[PDB]
Symmetry: D2
Subunit: 267 residues, 4 copies
């Protein structure tokens, strides 16, 4: 068990194709004992999570809610037992209003929409860290989910900006987490067929956006020297468990590419 | 005259040590005809700008004001004469509440403060572009001011995150500006003794912050293979005029380092 | 005249579609007085260079020849007049044996071939600098030609490795050049139809290589937010003259992308 | 056992403070069965390797020797048993003549010296891959040792250029290795007190070089958000075993920083 006896908080499960769901599953297969957080649709999330290899408390967390944040650590400690701490935290959370994405002009997204997106997608990495570092063990790991924003691309639009912000935040979180002996890192994943991605591909953000997204997926597996299967989230779950383990002890404020190697290849 | 007969909008002048002020001065020395925008203290800015080599209309612009943005192009066209367009736009604007900077813990900046910062420092590059592209000429140039955020550093804190966002925005603005034959780029400057920098160094953000800022300035001139004078903004003004000229016609969505070469050297 | 009264050494002219040829032409249009160097086919190069806007001495230079290097500065000073120095140096030189490129397996290039390539394409930037810095003026500029090697690509193969080396060398040359008040930088160009590129596209390195090169050119203009014309070397000549001018005084050990903005865009 | 029943080739052991030695030790602790290669001083290396947790064949390999390379796979297969293949390959090899390093001027390293360095330090990653890929299993991993060359630094000089080349080579090796289902990646380590590093620090490359190296080590632990112990190679051995394991299946042609997070922090 890569994660034997480690205690890990996992956020961002919404369906059974969530990257968070596969992160959780793999971790439990590797002996981790889990605590889960969900946003808003808790009966759905309970129902979905009942299918994991093992039982795990589910805690409500709206990342934009001050009270949820303020009460989070107490709730976790309650769930894992007093005198016990977390060895790992997983941030698999994101959101951007439609106006900030797809065939909707870049220039036409109101700041209030862009602000909400950055709030949930970037700022919350800092917020969760703030709430949870006090109840983490030395040797601990924090992991967030990333999509390489170092270049502009069609349709991703303002989410790219949110990911750029996130990478920056991750480096500062690394500075804070360090005072606790805790690592902080991001996993940069290739495209995966999830609820959030289904939106885009299915034309809910405009048909041309859906088309560019599809071309994206296809170019990816082409570039990837080992290929890329956008229906299989396991390779990125396995990568996230690696960061949660003891086997990358000298890495922090850093980005790990679980993308088939695509970003290293121009063509 | 590098900028003979070009029409250039310059924002961000607040004192006579503003990077924007030296940008404006150099440009006029190079034959540009200017239009200026200022935030809030317009009598001060008029008074300051009266010292430029030549007269130039001053227009009010609060980057967070919808009406200012909406009316901006009409006001400019009024100032430069109907049937005339802009050949250049300079964004030299930034702001971050104290909570997001210095010895104030990273984790203690409220999102409302961080949001305001990103609004003025990143989002506004898109906002200005949106308002001004319609009245720009093909061959035109947009330039923003940057401070290399690719690594975390003490004290800069949330402004770094804002700069990360800005670089991302710049790449998307490049996509829009391209439809007009207009370039968009950022200048990444070394440390310059300005009002905004005086804050930091002078301990208004905490003494330890002031001390780290001073160490920063010093390491900079050390690393720079040609050195760095933090009292002299001319080298970065000259660099911004280069981008505004016809001599970098094949560059866009890109970052130019006016930093003495510091970022290319580890030690 | 951007380059009025500046004295500039330009290497790498072989035909009239050489990037070096267009660099030279633009510079002379901008008032520079030139000295030229050529490799091996000097009658051809004389004949080609007779078509520049103005007369300019031609000096022999095999970059792998110790004597040429050793005698270079004496020959230049002879050409520009004693007591006169160089304000600029242009490195537009490259070579890689066929074994290191195209459909010829990466693994099948003998080190002796790869060594020759790196010698001429990377190491020589240091060699020229060494020979010429002693006869340069403060305020001076050295410029090399680059093709962004930060990612792997088909066919470019070992030349990519040579370009990676070159970028590294450029940063160290910046350290040396700095002791003289001289800048050193690279221009990263998009694809241009030259003799060296004609090889590749024309199938002399294998048909599949020719095909990947053609796809490359096409994706480029697609990605470029302002487009890209691979038949027009002027935009990169103009960019090289900018670096040779006084208008980027705070840039060194750095890379400037004259690539239409392509590298900033994923899709 | 992270590496249970995997067969791994490890190169670059010279003393018991070699990164390769600690790589080998950790791997065996994790259940790997090993084959070792050494350069030139084989009695020394045998003697040193006798101290590993388990016995492992030692094979001679001069990376510049064509016959060694040509015969390598036959020798390995002989050592691991016919019908058995390698699951992992470790490249922990480097060399640069003194002229290319330290207080010896950058400009004064003869190409023949720089060529030898690049041969052993960069080119050999391709050479080993070429010799060994045919006897590797799908799911396999190749790992090389790196020192982040993205910026210039004192004293490292031409080794930096060699590391720049190596990173480039790694991306192309990823393309070849991919045809076999094999990953290729580099580990970028922080400073470690080894034989090769002892040289530098001890003034054998000049006292000023020794002094800059010492300052380097010190700045490192300062920048590292989790710190850095230059006497402890275990954290980078653990990181190399992670890449050799099944837990980073979607990473290739890539670089992993085992550097305490130093490269992510400016100050
Ligand atoms: N699917 C891809 O292709 C891909 C690739 C790289 C990175 N990522 C990243 O992976 C992470 C998870 O995305 P996914 O692909 O699994 O989609 P998803 O729909 O399965 O999960 C996204 C998560 O965001 C959570 N969330 C949204 N608003 C919230 C709020 N206000 N408070 C708390 N939680 C909130 C949702 O409830 C949900 O569980 C994201 O950060 C995403 O950007 C996805
Ligand atoms: N001084 C440095 O060391 C340095 C280095 C690199 C980059 N920069 C960047 O250069 C630019 C200018 O900064 P500076 O050093 O000249 O400081 P400065 O004080 O001279 O100018 C900053 C500008 O922000 C403007 N501004 C703030 N809020 C605004 C709003 N709501 N609407 C419209 N304008 C607003 C101010 O009025 C002011 O003119 C910034 O974007 C900054 O981050 C500065
Ligand atoms: N054409 C492109 O698409 C492109 C794009 C980006 C960068 N570059 C770079 O631009 C530079 C010039 O290439 P080009 O496109 O003009 O091709 P080119 O054929 O016009 O010029 C290449 C130059 O290399 C010189 N050279 C080769 N071996 C030499 C030696 N031993 N000693 C002295 N000189 C030697 C040649 O004589 C020649 O003039 C190169 O360094 C190249 O890699 C080209
Ligand atoms: N020690 C550090 O601080 C550090 C940091 C980052 C990366 N690295 C890299 O780690 C790797 C190992 O270096 P080290 O620190 O363990 O020093 P080391 O002295 O322990 O090992 C270096 C290896 O190079 C091998 N070698 C040299 N020439 C060879 C040849 N012609 N053929 C075959 N093998 C040859 C040596 O025999 C030796 O085992 C290198 O590639 C190095 O650059 C070292
Ligand atoms: C541009 C076409 C390529 C698609 C990128 C892949 C992807 C898919 C889903 C992603 O998650 C989100 C996307 C938007 C908003 C919120 C989330 C979680 C995500 O962050 C990335
Ligand atoms: C961290 C210590 C090093 C100082 C960095 C130099 C600097 C100085 C002033 C800058 O402008 C701002 C800084 C904060 C908020 C707003 C602006 C314009 C700025 O963006 C950068
Ligand atoms: C891989 C398909 C894309 C082509 C890249 C464009 C290009 C064209 C010519 C170039 O110059 C050389 C190429 C090889 C060897 C020598 C030189 C000068 C060069 O460096 C780059
Ligand atoms: C510049 C001062 C900082 C030292 C860098 C750390 C280091 C130490 C040893 C290294 O290995 C070599 C160094 C030179 C030549 C050969 C090798 C293996 C190496 O590659 C890196």
């Amino acid at each position: 068990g890569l994660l034997d006896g480690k205690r890990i908080l996992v956020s961002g499960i919404i369906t059974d194709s969530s990257i968070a769901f596969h992160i959780a599953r793999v971790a439990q297969e590797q002996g981790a004992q889990l605590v889960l957080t969900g946003f808003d649709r808790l009966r759905l999330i309970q129902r979905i999570t009942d299918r994991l290899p093992a039982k795990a408390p589910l805690l409500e967390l709206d990342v934009q809610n001050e009270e949820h944040l303020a009460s989070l650590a107490g709730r976790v400690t309650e769930a894992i037992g007093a005198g016990n701490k977390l060895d790992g935290v997983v941030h698999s959370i994101g959101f951007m209003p439609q106006t900030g994405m797809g065939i909707n002009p870049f220039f036409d997204a109101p700041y209030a929409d862009v602000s909400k997106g950055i709030h949930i997608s970037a700022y919350s990495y800092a917020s969760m860290a703030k709430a949870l570092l006090p109840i983490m063990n030395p040797g601990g790991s924090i992991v967030g989910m990333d999509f390489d924003p170092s270049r502009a691309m069609p349709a991703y639009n303002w989410m790219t900006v949110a990911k750029s912000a996130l990478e920056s935040v991750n480096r500062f979180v690394a500075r804070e987490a360090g005072k606790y002996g805790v690592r902080s890192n991001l996993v940069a994943a290739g495209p995966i067929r999830t609820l959030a991605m289904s939106a885009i591909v299915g034309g809910a953000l405009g048909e041309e956006a859906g088309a560019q997204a599809q071309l994206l997926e296809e170019g990816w597996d082409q570039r990837a020297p080992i290929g890329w299967n956008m229906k299989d989230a396991t390779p990125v779950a396995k990568t996230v468990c690696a960061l949660l383990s003891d086997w990358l002890p000298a890495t922090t404020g850093d980005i790990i590419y679980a993308d088939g190697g695509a970003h290293t290849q121009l063509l």
